[PDB]
């Protein structure tokens, strides 16, 4: 019950709508898998706010097979800086291989993303980085 029409109304509060709606579509439309979501956050029950996110899975060649590495997407109206946040949410069967980018908090803080600044930031690359980092050695593994 959240079509493109309703999406606009949900992302109307955002400042960079044209960039927030184009960045998401570009991905979900290219990776034909990422599903758009809308979750509002609160500051210790002191103040709420509308927030959009993207949850889905991304294939990956490993061990001679095609594994799926689930990952979530976070968005902001402008704060703290501007760039969208990244997070991972694997399944109970999967795990979180601690490393340099895949911390124990399902975070994906990458150097390429840390020092990332538009106009090269379209969200399309934000997903590609993981496709490469996870394409060499997926951390979501579960030690079969």
> Domain of 16: which CATH number?
3.10.110.10
| Rounded CA separation 144/142 (Å) | 6
- Structure tokens, 101: 């980018």
**Measured distance CA(105)–CA(79) in Å, rounded:** 21
Residues contacting residue 125 through CB under 8 Å, at least 6 positions apart: none
The Cα-based distances of 85 to 28, 54, 115 in angstroms read 16, 11, 13
Q: Give how many domains the chain has, as a whole number.
A: 1
Find the length of the chain.
Answer: 144
Q: Which domain holds residue 91?
A: 1-144
- CA–CA separation, 115 and 1 (whole Å): 37
The residues, any chain, with a CB within 8 Å of residue 48's CB and separated by 6 or more, are: 40, 41, 42
Helix ranges (DSSP H) in the chain: 4-10, 17-30, 111-114, 124-136
| Whole-number Cα distances in Å, 135 to 61, 76, 88, 124 | 6, 28, 15, 16
Q: Residue 8: exposed, middle, or buried by beta-carbon count in 10 A (0-12, 13-18, 19+)?
A: exposed
CB 74 within 8 A of CB 65: no
């Amino acid at each position: 019950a959240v079509s493109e029409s309703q999406l606009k109304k949900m992302v109307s509060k955002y400042k960079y709508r044209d960039l927030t709606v184009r960045e998401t579509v570009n991905v979900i439309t290219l990776y034909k898998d990422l599903k758009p979501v809308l979750d509002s956050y609160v500051f210790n029950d002191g103040s709420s706010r509308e927030l959009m996110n993207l949850t889905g899975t991304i294939p990956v060649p490993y061990r001679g097979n095609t594994y799926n590495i689930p990952i979530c997407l976070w968005l902001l109206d402008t704060y703290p800086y501007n760039p969208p946040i990244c997070f991972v949410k694997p399944t109970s069967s999967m795990t979180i291989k601690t490393g340099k980018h895949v911390d124990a908090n399902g975070k994906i803080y990458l150097p390429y993303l840390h020092e990332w600044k538009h106009p090269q930031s379209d969200l399309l690359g934000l997903i590609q980085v993981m496709i490469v980092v996870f394409g060499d050695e997926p951390p979501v593994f579960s030690r079969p």
